[model samples]
Target chain A: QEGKAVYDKACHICHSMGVAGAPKAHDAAAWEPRIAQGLDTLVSTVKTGKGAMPPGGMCTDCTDEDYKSAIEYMSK
Target chain B: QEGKAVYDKACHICHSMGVAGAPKAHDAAAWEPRIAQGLDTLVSTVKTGKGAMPPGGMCTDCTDEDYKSAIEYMSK
Candidate 1:
C-alpha cells in the first residue's frame, strides 16, 4: 500500500505492538470494529485522535491522504 | 524546563517506560554513564539515533536546543 512507508515510520510505533490499546496492524479482529465504522470515520479519528492514539497517529507530517492510506493499510 | 513539553510529547513514549532499553527518565544510574559523555554526545545520539531510538529521537519538530533541554530535564 502507499501507506507502507508512512506506517513504518510513524504508525508502527504503537500499532505494530498494540501499545496503548492501538489496534495491531494486520489483526483483522482488532480492526474489525473500527473498520465497520467506515474509512471516513477512521480518518476523522486519526485527525482528532481517540483514546491513546494521538492525533495524526503521531505522523505530524502526514497529509490527510496519508492518514487514510495508513488506516487502510493497517486494516488489512 | 523548556523540554518538559517536548519530552512529554515524544521522548516519554520510550524513555518514561525504558522501552527497548531506553534509559528511564530521572533514573540517575541509567543516565549517569551517558550523561558523563556530555550533552554534545547526547544530542548527537538523538540526531543519529541508537539502538531502538529512531533518528531525531522521534520528535520530528524538535530543534537541537529542544533535544538538549529534554536531555537535561530527563536527567533529573
Candidate 2:
C-alpha cells in the first residue's frame, strides 16, 4: 500500500525500465534470487547500495521497514 | 521530455503528492511565487536544499541542467 505508492512514483523509474541494470518490476523471477537471501538482507542491500544501485534505495528517507514493505509489494 | 522523465522518476514523489510542503506539480498557482523566484534561484534551492527538500535535490547525480529541465517542466 504505502510502499506501493512509493514504488509507483520513485522506484519504478529504474525498476520498471530496468535502466542501468535495475530489476524490472513484477519480475518475480528477477527478484527470486534476491528473495532467497531473506528480507533483512534485501533491505540492507537497498540501504547500503550496490553496483548499479545508489544509496537512495528509491527513496532517501526510507528505513528498513519501508524497504521491506516495498520488497513484499514487489515480490508478491 | 527528458525533464518530465526525471520528474516522473523522483521529483514527483514529493511534488505531485504535496508531501512535506512541497509545491504540487502542474499547479501554476502554487508555482507562481516560485516562478517569481526565477529558474536560477530555483535551481540553487534544489541544489542547496530548502525547507523539506534535501541537499541531493532528490537526484544526487543530477547536474544543473537536469535541475533546470525538471523545474521548467514542472513549472509549466
TM-score of chain B only, all predictions?
A: 0.70, 0.68
Q: Give the alpha carbon lDDT tens digit for every residue of A1-76 in model 1.
A: 3334433444345324334544655567877998899888887887785544455555565655666666665566
Report the Cα lDDT for residue B35, model 1.
88
**How many steric overlaps are in each model, in order?**
0, 0
Q: Which residue ranges in model 2 land beyond 4 Å of their true spot?
A: A1-76, B1-19
Model 1 clashing-pair count: 0
Worst 10 residues of 2 chain A by lDDT: A10-19
Give one digit per residue, the lDDT tens place, for model 1 in B1-76.
1233433454244334334555655566777888899989888987886644556655566666666666665565
Among incorrect, acceptable, medium and high, the docking class of model 1 is incorrect
DockQ, prediction 2: 0.05
- Estimate the TM-score of every prediction: 0.45, 0.41
- Sliding window of 10 residues with minimal summed lDDT for model 1 chain A: A1-10
Clashes of 2: 0
